[PDB]
């Protein structure tokens, strides 16, 4: 049980660190760059 709790805590902290670094990278970027693809004139491309 202690080992399972330790692994759960480790994965939770890893996920929290990943979310924190993703948000930090988003803050550094001027705008939220997201993938786009659309074949038309200057319309709004769809969001993935």
């Amino acid at each position: 049980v202690l080992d399972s709790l330790e692994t759960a805590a480790a994965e939770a902290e890893e996920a929290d660190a990943q979310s924190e670094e993703c948000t930090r990278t988003e803050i550094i970027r001027n705008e939220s760059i997201h993938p786009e693809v659309q074949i038309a004139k200057n319309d709004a491309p769809l969001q993935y």
């Binding site: 202690l2 709790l5 330790e6 805590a9 480790a10």
Partner: protein, 44 residues
Amino acid sequence: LGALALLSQACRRMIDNVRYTRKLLMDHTEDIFQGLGYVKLLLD
């Protein structure tokens, strides 16, 4: 990870203490049996 490592160390030391207590109890029971056998031999 420090708290998890400390918990694992505590579990390991408590397991070692339980094993040592069991070994001490086994040694005490063996000593009692040997003493009873010696007493029986003295009164044989």
